Amino acid sequence: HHPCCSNPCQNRGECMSTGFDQYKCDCTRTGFYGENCTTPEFLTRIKLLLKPTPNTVHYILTHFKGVWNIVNNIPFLRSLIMKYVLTSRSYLIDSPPTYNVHYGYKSWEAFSNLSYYTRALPPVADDCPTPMGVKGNKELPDSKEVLEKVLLRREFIPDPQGSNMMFAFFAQHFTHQFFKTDHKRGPGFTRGLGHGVDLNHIYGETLDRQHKLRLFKDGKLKYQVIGGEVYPPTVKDTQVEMIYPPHIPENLQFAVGQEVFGLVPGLMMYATIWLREHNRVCDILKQEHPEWGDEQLFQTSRLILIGETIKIVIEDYVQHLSGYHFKLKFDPELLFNQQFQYQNRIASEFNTLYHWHPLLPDTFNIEDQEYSFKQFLYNNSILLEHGLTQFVESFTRQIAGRVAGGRNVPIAVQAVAKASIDQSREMKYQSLNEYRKRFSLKPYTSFEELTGEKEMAAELKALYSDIDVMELYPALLVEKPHPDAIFGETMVELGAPFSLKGLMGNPICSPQYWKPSTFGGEVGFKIINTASIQSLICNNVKGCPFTSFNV
Amino acid sequence: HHPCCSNPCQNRGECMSTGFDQYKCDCTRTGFYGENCTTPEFLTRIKLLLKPTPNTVHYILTHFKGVWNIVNNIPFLRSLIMKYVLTSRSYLIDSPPTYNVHYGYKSWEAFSNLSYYTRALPPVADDCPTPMGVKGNKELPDSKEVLEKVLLRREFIPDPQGSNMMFAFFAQHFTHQFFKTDHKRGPGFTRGLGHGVDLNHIYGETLDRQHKLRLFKDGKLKYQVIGGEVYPPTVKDTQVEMIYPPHIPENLQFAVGQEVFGLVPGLMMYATIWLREHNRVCDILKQEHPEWGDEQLFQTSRLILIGETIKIVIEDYVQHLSGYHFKLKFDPELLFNQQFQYQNRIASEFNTLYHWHPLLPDTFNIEDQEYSFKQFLYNNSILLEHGLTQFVESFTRQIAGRVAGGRNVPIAVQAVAKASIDQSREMKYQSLNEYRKRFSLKPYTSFEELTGEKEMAAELKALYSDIDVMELYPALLVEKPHPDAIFGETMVELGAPFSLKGLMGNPICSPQYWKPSTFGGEVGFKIINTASIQSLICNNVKGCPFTSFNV
Ligand code: COH
Ligand code: COH
Ligand SMILES: *[C@@H]1O[C@H](CO)[C@@H](O[C@@H]2O[C@H](CO)[C@@H](O[C@H]3O[C@H](CO)[C@@H](O)[C@H](O)[C@@H]3O)[C@H](O)[C@H]2NC(C)=O)[C@H](O)[C@H]1NC(C)=O
Ligand SMILES: *[C@@H]1O[C@H](CO)[C@@H](O[C@@H]2O[C@H](CO)[C@@H](O[C@H]3O[C@H](CO)[C@@H](O)[C@H](O)[C@@H]3O)[C@H](O)[C@H]2NC(C)=O)[C@H](O)[C@H]1NC(C)=O
Ligand SMILES: *[C@@H]1O[C@H](CO)[C@@H](O[C@H]2O[C@H](CO)[C@@H](O)[C@H](O)[C@H]2NC(C)=O)[C@H](O)[C@H]1NC(C)=O
Ligand SMILES: *[C@H]1O[C@@H](CO)[C@@H](O[C@@H]2O[C@H](CO)[C@@H](O)[C@H](O)[C@H]2NC(C)=O)[C@H](O)[C@H]1NC(C)=O
Ligand SMILES: CCCCC/C=C\C/C=C\C/C=C\C/C=C\CCCC(=O)OC[C@@H](O)CO
Ligand SMILES: CCCCC/C=C\C/C=C\C/C=C\C/C=C\CCCC(=O)OC[C@@H](O)CO
Ligand SMILES: CCCCCCCCO[C@@H]1O[C@H](CO)[C@@H](O)[C@H](O)[C@H]1O
Ligand SMILES: *[C@@H]1O[C@H](CO)[C@@H](O)[C@H](O)[C@H]1NC(C)=O
């Protein structure tokens, strides 16, 4: 078998076979040497005794609300801290990207082929003696058993951080521009070739789709007016392909950038809001530039919207997730004297860790009604009937489920949770502990340490035998959450760097783009710099209902 | 008409219309302010007063051989000098890229559509009152008149810098991996979607093409053996599309990565050499790694050859072109503590300036035959008849033509030169002086200053009237050359930043790729770091003939 199956190289060292039965570790720039890159260089010894634990940094940012209220009001200090928040993560992500599902070594194929999700850790080799390498049993536990024992929801567990349905649907809508698995090819492949925040979920992935969605007047996107309300146009009107079941009538087949957004009325809500936003921004640009044509209005509105999106994601969305008392800041300028790559490639593991189906409630509560999954799925009538204003009011009110802590996957999506496990396996993911080490965390020494509890730990011990072969995805869902938090440590430490990279990596954040001229002058620039989840709703939803990501 | 037609914003200010008849310049990070970005900031006045002119720097690098002799043999200094050389040429290229033929403002479409060449300067707006903006006559001069008066060769002018046919054909072979105009779409479109040094001219642009070219045994490329000599495989064996006239015999229809390489036996000489190199490297890696399969042998040899190419281009090819006494060095480590983007997008103007058709001789002198263009085109027989050894010996001793200095484009390719002019105009290129300002040079004040001579200057003055509307492409070919040099200032000052960006931008130069494990261990890494034009020929051409880029 492959001599690297046991994952012998530590500290970001690279493993390579050197004959049938031997390996060598490449310890270049790891700050370690020795056979397995485990012997620290002198500067590394000094860096390691002085480096705070990820859990210490977390504690500082989630306590001392009094000190943070001061820090948050000294612009120079707020800049300084946000600068640290951005750069301390940066070094963890390979950019240019490296591995993928087919390439556990660097290759031009893995670098150049945009159809692959990239990989933060190389796949376990095909001929390893155990699924994870060398440790554990010949087979992993039945995924149905892992699912039923520790993942599935008994009683609904609300998120103690107060995440609402505005948040859950925003997560779903936002991330589905860059997580668009190409099932024809396999779970390690993506249809999102832009690999980030390009808003293809609004504008379409291909130019042909964009052109069918565009009005070609005033930069605007096509729309329809129903009962005086602006909604997306239909499939028959646009000829834009969407996924709908057969029983869905022509008039309820709304056409948006992303093929799957008819699935959920929560997604259609956001699609409608962003469509209105784009056309609202067109109206403003046209007022500033009576001389501009359709094409420039469209393109400039897209860049503004991309900027709005990143702004909202950092300052409301990540802000809410973080539980930080520190006020996060979207400011591209903070990277201008730093080493940073303005490019991104979506990692398979980022897709995997974002399968937050425990956010989903048992029923969807709009106004006085309590819709089941059966009733809610593919039902855009519900949207037309209640309207965006009520959708916003209801979803702002409705609490979402806790993601970590175990046993919170709604039964309605059990098949999806099973697939995340099976497809992790099919893609040959390395173990939870391997991922933890890759992200500068201590491997868990037992199942009780992972869960912080006894009962689930015991189930997991019986299923997996060895903590070092525990799988990444179920571990994220059963991990001991931070105190009163939605997630545990592994989710935060893997998610945050993938997030920073995808947000700041965007070309609009580079010095040649980050200028008022890029966005049609100072007014367009200000739309980006003052954007928020509240203003997005206020500007585009009748009556300007109040909103946020917490209940 | 568009209020930016006159190009009012200086110093890399960005121009934007604010009404029908008004503009605003965006002076962000230019170091200037005021209406047209022409007033310098205090620190800018200083930076201006100190900073040496590009010509003064060229003089220092092409003189004082005694000093350079010391520096070159003192590694720490060589390295510090190369680091300057690399980082000064850097800030000149927009990266992430910006404009293209259809987008004179920044847009997601220009960012993301890899099918365009990018643009260093945006195009002249469609409705401008003159071809170059507002200066000059309503029509630029007949392009045949320009071609015939100042471009066409009367008498062959040899390169006083000593460039040979080995150099001339290396330039053509190498550049044709990234200059691959998609004539079906237009001159501003490329088929080279990798946008750099990916070796698609050897391996194929598509996976479909690569796979038909591969042996699938030991990592190797398919080949044939004719008279005991290894040549590329045929079109019939591989089913790889090549451009060939109907009349060419089955066996001389060589199939290589780049579809046009059967055009010229000079091109097929290098194609064959590089094919041999790839399979030679396979052999070395197979020896190192008996455990490796076909796929990893192939991909690893590919990365090795990419490195080989960059190394040769920097240390042999650019070295020769530069006329420097200083010894350029390929060493990715020199950028590791610098700010640099590991990405490239091929610029249209880089394609344009690289039309070095004056390099071409009047006949192709092999052994004691002197082949006309008519005889040499598409004649792979010549290659088989003489063999690679004679090709190398003959092309090493044959002088190439001077590029700058005027009147040296061979009549045989007059149509290509005319097309360079017409296509510049079709892509709405700004004038020579706009390009010189864009690359930190003073605009020429007269035609005589451009040519350094009287007679062509007068023909040009009569044709164009204003130096400020002189065109880029013809200017490059008529420019006063540097002393005893093949090129003039504008060629060097534009070409150099485009070059080093595309060389160092490659992902193999990034910290996560620049490691021995990437190339199969120390042995593969060493193939790269010891590569030379002489070693390429020595390892792959029978009899190991002497070669170099100069006669
Ligand atoms: C971010 C949180 C989030 C939420 C709130 C959410 C809400 C919901 C929801 C009710 C609104 C339903 C019925 C589903 C149902 C599904 N989800 Co999600 N999903 C979420 C994150 C994801 C992600 C990420 C994927 C992977 C998408 C991909 O790779 O294409 C996913 C995949 C799926 C799949 C497999 C899709 C396929 O292409 O086969 C189904 C089915 N689901 N989900
Ligand atoms: C770098 C030096 C160089 C040399 C030595 C060279 C040598 C020769 C040569 C010698 C046997 C011949 C017969 C030609 C003939 C042509 N070359 Co060049 N070319 C060169 C640089 C270029 C470049 C750059 C282009 C543009 C390529 C593109 O845009 O695809 C080009 C394009 C062409 C074209 C038109 C575009 C096309 O259809 O491909 C013709 C015809 N040629 N060339
Ligand atoms: C990026 O990698 C993708 C996966 O390797 C690749 O898709 C694959 O493309 C190949 C070649 O075009 C397809 O192979 C086809 O042709 C062979 C032999 O001629 C047939 O036996 C196959 O049935 C098939 O029709 C594969 O279908 C395809 N593999 C997949 C999708 O898993 C992409 O082409 C690559 N992208 C780029 C830009 O190169
Ligand atoms: C890369 O940018 C390219 C330049 O615009 C683009 O090429 C263009 O593609 C469009 C749409 O696919 C073609 O226009 C079509 O318009 C109607 C459809 O209703 C048809 O009647 C036309 O025949 C045509 O299909 C343009 O012809 C085409 N322009 C060209 C070839 O120069 C690429 O598609 C863009 N690439 C990506 C990945 O978005
Ligand atoms: C190098 O790291 C590897 C870790 O896999 C070590 O490999 C061996 O060490 C084990 C216990 O120390 C032995 O039982 C085995 O022979 C072997 N393990 C495996 C998985 O085969 C090796 O000791 C390390 N060497 C150094 C320098 O620490
Ligand atoms: C910088 O920009 C140019 C704009 O082109 C200059 O305007 C020019 O002023 C000239 C002198 O009065 C006029 O001859 C001419 O009308 C005008 N050029 C054009 C094409 O309109 C601005 O004055 C200058 N601005 C400043 C403040 O220096
Ligand atoms: C591919 C495009 C990327 C966009 C993805 C956007 C958001 C994904 C959000 C979260 C992933 C999971 C967990 C991390 C979230 C919050 C914890 C702390 C956040 C933090 O420290 O700043 C995080 C800071 O680094 C971010 O800038
Ligand atoms: C797209 C991938 C990039 C590969 C391009 C490779 C080769 C092109 C070679 C030279 C640049 C093009 C035209 C001439 C410009 C400069 C050459 C002369 C002097 C020089 O380069 O030195 C200037 C000094 O700075 C040394 O660099
Ligand atoms: C191979 C060149 C054919 C061009 C002939 C038509 C254009 C003539 O052009 C003329 O050529 C003369 C001789 O070089 C020069 O002295 C003149 O300045 C030039 O205008
Ligand atoms: C569709 O949703 C609507 C709400 O407008 C609901 O009344 C109806 O029962 C749903 N239909 C189905 C088939 O679930």
Ligand SMILES: *[C@@H]1O[C@H](CO)[C@@H](O)[C@H](O)[C@H]1NC(C)=O
């Ligand atoms: C083909 O090249 C060969 C060299 O072997 C030569 O003898 C012959 O004349 C050439 N054919 C043409 C069409 O010039």
